Amino acid sequence: ETGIGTLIIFIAMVLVAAVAATVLINTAGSLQQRATSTGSQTTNQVSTGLIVQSIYGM
């Protein structure tokens, strides 16, 4: 009967959907750390600087 064949494919459908879910989570986690670090590094880059007061010679 059709009942047996339906159950077999059902298991396969669940496993496939889990794979595509894993890709999206892993990619978002990788891009999270890069975007956070870039923001913090740029903030330090703009604000920091050195200034010359006076120059003397002998």
Next chain:
Amino acid sequence: ETGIGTLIIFIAMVLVAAVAATVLINTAGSLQQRATSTGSQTTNQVSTGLIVQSIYGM
């Protein structure tokens, strides 16, 4: 996310305004001492002099 880029440029705008402020203050302080000294030196120069009373010979 227009808010992020606004804040970054804002920091730079503040720093540039501080630079132009420093130039005007430093220049005015330098010109102050020259203008003060010149006035006092000229006052002495005009008012001072020597006079000959009488001349004798042997």
